[PDB]
Amino acid sequence: NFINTNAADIIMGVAKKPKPIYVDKRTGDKHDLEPSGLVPKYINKKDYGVT
Amino acid sequence: MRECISIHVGQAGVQIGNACWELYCLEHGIQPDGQMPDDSFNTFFSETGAGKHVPRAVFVDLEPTVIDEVRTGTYRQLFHPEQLITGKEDAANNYARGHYTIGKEIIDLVLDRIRKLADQCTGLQGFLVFHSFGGGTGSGFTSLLMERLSVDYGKKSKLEFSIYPAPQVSTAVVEPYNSILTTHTTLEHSDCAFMVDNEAIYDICRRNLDIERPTYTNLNRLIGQIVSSITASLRFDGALNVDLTEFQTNLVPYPRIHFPLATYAPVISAEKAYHEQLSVAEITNACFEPANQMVKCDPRHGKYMACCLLYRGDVVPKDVNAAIATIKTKRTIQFVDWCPTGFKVGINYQPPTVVPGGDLAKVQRAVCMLSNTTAIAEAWARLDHKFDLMYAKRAFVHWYVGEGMEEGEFSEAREDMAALEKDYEEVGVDS
Amino acid sequence: MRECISIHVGQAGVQIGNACWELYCLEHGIQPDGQMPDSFNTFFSETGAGKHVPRAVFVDLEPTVIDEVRTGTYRQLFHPEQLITGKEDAANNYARGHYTIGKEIIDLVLDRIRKLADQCTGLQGFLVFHSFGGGTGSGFTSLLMERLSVDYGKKSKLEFSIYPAPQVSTAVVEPYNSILTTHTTLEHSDCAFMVDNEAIYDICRRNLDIERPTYTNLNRLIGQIVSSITASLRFDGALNVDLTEFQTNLVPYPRIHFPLATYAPVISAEKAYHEQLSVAEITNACFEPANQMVKCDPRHGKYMACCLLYRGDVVPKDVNAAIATIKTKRTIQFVDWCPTGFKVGINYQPPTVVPGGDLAKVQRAVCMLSNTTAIAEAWARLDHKFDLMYAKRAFVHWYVGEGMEEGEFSEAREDMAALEKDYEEVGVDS
Amino acid sequence: ATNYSANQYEKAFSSKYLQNWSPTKPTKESISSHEGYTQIIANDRGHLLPSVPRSKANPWGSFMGTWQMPLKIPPARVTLTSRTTAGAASLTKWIQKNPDLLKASNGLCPEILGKP
Amino acid sequence: LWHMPHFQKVGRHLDTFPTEADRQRALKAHREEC
Amino acid sequence: NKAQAAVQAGRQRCERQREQKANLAEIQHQSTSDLLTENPQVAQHPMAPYRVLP
Amino acid sequence: MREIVHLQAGQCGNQIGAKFWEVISDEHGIDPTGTYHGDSDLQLERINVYYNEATGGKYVPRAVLVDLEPGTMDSVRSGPFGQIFRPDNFVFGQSGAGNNWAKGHYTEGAELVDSVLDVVRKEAESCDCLQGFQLTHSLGGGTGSGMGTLLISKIREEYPDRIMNTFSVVPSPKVSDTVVEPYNATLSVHQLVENTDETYCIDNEALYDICFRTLKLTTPTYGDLNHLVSATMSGVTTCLRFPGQLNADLRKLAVNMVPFPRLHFFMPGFAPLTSRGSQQYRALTVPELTQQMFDAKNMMAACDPRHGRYLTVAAVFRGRMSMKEVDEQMLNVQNKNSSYFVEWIPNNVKTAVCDIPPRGLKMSATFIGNSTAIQELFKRISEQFTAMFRRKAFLHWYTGEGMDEMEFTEAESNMNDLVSEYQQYQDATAEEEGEF
């Protein structure tokens, strides 16, 4: 029963998570956000402040 | 110094704003270059000391093909270059695309620009947001716009003008999916939301203005006249003023009741304007007529629960009171029992202006009515019907689930306004 | 009588002093020949012939960048013995520029500094131009500071450094030179502003509408910052500022001496025709993360101290009204132990424009120098880049073969490890 | 850090009078009077001493970006006046559900007023 | 027209009446009127 | 500012025209270069008619 | 800003798209030598969608031509507009597939794709914001149906979140050009259902009767057939590169006619098709466009929707045109024919209007209709596949090239499960939930 199978696969699913992207200029200039340096990533590293 | 920030999101919002800002430039005497050939323009234009005037509006969209006409058209010098925000790829008639994926990289730049206009303002009355329910950007990105604007600004007025989906004719297939899920965001993050639909304005232009085939050019002019009639009390001197905060309070009695209907009268061709007189009584019964509604719903099934009247031109307060006393004695017009004084009036002196190429005529006086009814409950029983009828077999849901939202939001958005439908009858039942 | 000797070391320093001294001559009306067609006494020295000689020293280890100064338009302007050129470049090596090559010419450049400083009746301080990624800009700069601190006791010294960008760069071994310069600079410097090439690339593309910038386009924007910093030294104003002045109000602890620069407005002539700019609208763009010329968002950190430099037709009250608006914004945050974190400087002369440039004529401008806790992520990322290479002994045979020891790498990483521990505990509320 | 009132010209230096329409940082109305000198609680470099209590918040700040805010943002105007005892409970539970947004540096702070 | 039987047991969010007996009397009068 | 902007637009136009001229010159030189034209008279002994370049 | 990368497979692909690159060159005003010679100013506003800039102010197409034989490579270049393609985009093998899908997929086409993927990755990565890929091929051949479907399987893994279009030419029941036509058709539709966003079914016998009965041509050569499909390919992308009042690109169409990921087979059509003897006898206003567009004579697939059920319908208009008659005619055709449309989707028609008409014409329209009646095509192929597979007929060309006997079994089983899926959506119940 393709109706039931399609509805079951729909309900038993997880939404994908989009990659964070930001645009700066008035024209769309898509850049990635994580490696750009505007989000704190390397602060939360393990060896921060310790030899 | 009573200034309003206009937000034009979507293709519909931009194309409305082209006719709306064309009307404002002629109303205050501004050439398309942005200069002069009084300070009533100060609520919309900012005086650059060189003599230029810049509108306090932003044009935001997700595709370049609608705003590149503005950058090259005859108003290419009036607008600020950085107030026309342009994306790369559109939401493509999707809510999840315009909410979770594509709406988030531009919400930084839009709130950056809105902050700059808010800094320029010395007295702020509210934000006017123009969008359409059936679109992708108007569905998705506007939901983030109201949600973020509530975070940044606490209690500022958010007046909204929406293109409601027409009952029988529409230009999309997943349009009911887009329109269920925008109510849930806009119930708590919006202050007031007028609705119009394209089908009812088609019937008005066909029967009244003796024109057979309108386009989007001469429907946007009618919408621009309504927005001008609301704001004209802020701009011009009047015998009784109305602010944006007034009919916000006067049309919303309950937190879920913020859906008033906008109608305009008179709207006639230049051939019939020679032949008909236009008194205050003759224009105040046209807006009450169900055939002249700009929303495809009959208010005779419902009952008027608040009203607001805005008058322009040569109008006398004595004939206003005689007209309202006449319309209160009609048994066809029905009010609720808990609202004995259900009217609010406003009077302005300056008559409406005419634009070249327009379809309307030069009329000394006109009225604009904002009426809140109970007859929207049939307009949501139909719209819940066609959302349900295609949600039963779970159609088009793989397009929404795959962009970043789970399946549970569809049951939440349907359940929330199903309880609201029980709420409308609960208010509507008399004591 | 007040004056300043500028020193430009490295190819980055020479190419940034070429545009800086071009602006100074247009500002004071000096021909490229060197004669007029008394405020120039801070940057030029009078000859009995009437010719004006700049008080700048151009240092490099190669002749391929000094020779254009020796051939081009300003050939007759600079002194022939102020353009000091070595024999072989350091070639992206800290050890070459600090131990084996820079030793030969450090005696020559210190002789020249002493000859320019002999004319100092009253001297304010030195201005230094260098980059962290190069051999001469990092290796030679380190022992230049080491010997200048011994030679001159408490003279103020200022650095206009070019920080390596988080995403683009021009070298592979560049974090080795960055850490081996910072470790020496923490104890042998007074103040050190940074600027990033990637961030000015974004500023020039977004605001000035230049799709394909070049280093010659970047040097004008940095040169405007130097002019506005030393503007009140030359011109009158309502509130005067000095090099001793904005040193004290930006360094709370002698370990933290790292402010960020910001300039506003930076717009073209087409955009300036549309938008009018009062001083409220130019001071609201200094705190904007889209206008910061260091690639870091200050909103994730806390402001330690600020300094405002105003030029042009500027009113003292309208400055005060705009700062109180900034003080009551929830987004702009300060640490709990700086209740009074600002400083203003007022000047009358509007900024000048050079022919062939990109900026436009504007009545007023503002320059911002801010100490921010949100620079700790720049050190943390630069820590990881140095950490990730050095675990597998990459490019370490080049450094140890010149003469430095292996233990300098472990000691420099140990030094900035305590520096990162410093940026947290300062920003902890009581 | 802390704003201080001029106590007669405070009306001239408020937020909306200086054209800032967002919600405000608080102002210290009253000033406590100390007595004697103050004990010193930090190191020469700025480290806190081992004996002084330390707050457990983030030392960098509480700013919340675009991609970190909750997907269903609670509203800033909340009145439970004419609602049912279940609907108002659902709204205040939705308010309570995310403590991160309330205490942030941006910090949408709802004012729950009234009774159902 | 037609709605899901799944979305038919949801209540009403507002109350806007003093007591429940007055609400029931008003609903009975409305049913008699219609 | 308006006059200066007009001058800047003129400079941009001249830069584009110079770029196109340089492209045309490069195409002409490549279309006349020996490596692409395969000229058989490149391989000739300069002072000897009978001998050829190896 | 939204680039479309064109790729062509087979003799059918290289002769259809060669006409396609001639009709949009005339639309944008490009002479055969490459430069621009036109009058309007908005013709260069969006030209980067299909063209790459070159020196001297000339333009080259963003297309690659793929074949396993140099026979039509020498002929497309020698054509009228054959000097506009870049000569590095021509890729071709030295031995033909010979109408064998196994050679095109496993033996001969397995080495050429190492060269094709380098060229198409070079062309796609230069684009600042890619819209998607567009492929023209025929399922009745060896090098188009065999290697062209391997390109699809490779590109979809490399670029997942893009748009894939296939203007596939399905076999016809009556032309009977090749004996092994059902073998190549069955093994390729099985691959087309899993990794394709949009598919258009062009049939040759549905192009023959239009040129005979509607267009009234004495000699309907292949130049006339390929003008019809190139007009549909130009009309589907007209809101992407030309301004209008209500725009709709490929992604906005794909989200509206595809309600389930296995339901992506469409039906093209072109409305203004008249002859010289009757071009003065009728006007071509909006009622006349929508009267001919929905007509089963005009449709480009050789199976009648009158025996089926319309799932979703699209219509893209061209030229400066009123909005009220467009919406009136679309509402009228839904309301009168209340039995040919589905009931579990309201308002089945999606409408777009562009402002720039095709050249030589003032007003035009195109049709994209997702119908249940497309299962007539698959059952007709299945009954010919299962008739000749009982006998091991023509198998020694396939099973002698590393192919087992189980690929044919699974190719017809999933294709039989495909027609069972289309059937239940047609006969789905009214106003009722399920066990889900």
Ligand SMILES: Nc1nc2c(ncn2[C@@H]2O[C@H](COP(=O)(O)OP(=O)(O)OP(=O)(O)O)[C@@H](O)[C@H]2O)c(=O)[nH]1
């Ligand atoms: N009244 C009026 N409505 C318009 C106009 N233009 C578009 N619309 C409405 O917009 C709806 C379609 O959505 P659009 O606004 O065109 O597109 P969008 O909101 O930008 O979302 P996307 O399609 O994803 O780009 C139609 O149903 C129309 O009702 C107009 O000029 N006037």
Ligand SMILES: Nc1nc2c(ncn2[C@@H]2O[C@H](COP(=O)(O)OP(=O)(O)OP(=O)(O)O)[C@@H](O)[C@H]2O)c(=O)[nH]1
């Ligand atoms: N901002 C800016 N940086 C420059 C400029 N020119 C060079 N640089 C910087 O200089 C760095 C590389 O150093 P070099 O250009 O080789 O000059 P150097 O410091 O003397 O190094 P060596 O030539 O090896 O002695 C690059 O990373 C650039 O960031 C300039 O004009 N502006």
Ligand SMILES: Nc1nc2c(ncn2[C@@H]2O[C@H](COP(=O)(O)OP(=O)(O)O)[C@@H](O)[C@H]2O)c(=O)[nH]1
């Ligand atoms: N519509 C159309 N069909 C064509 C064209 N050229 C060939 N065909 C059809 O394609 C069939 C042969 O396909 P074939 O050339 O073997 O495909 P290939 O092996 O992939 O190159 C013939 O029966 C023709 O009907 C064309 O230009 N247009």
Ligand SMILES: [Mg+2]
């Ligand atoms: Mg949109």
Ligand SMILES: [Mg+2]
């Ligand atoms: Mg060097």
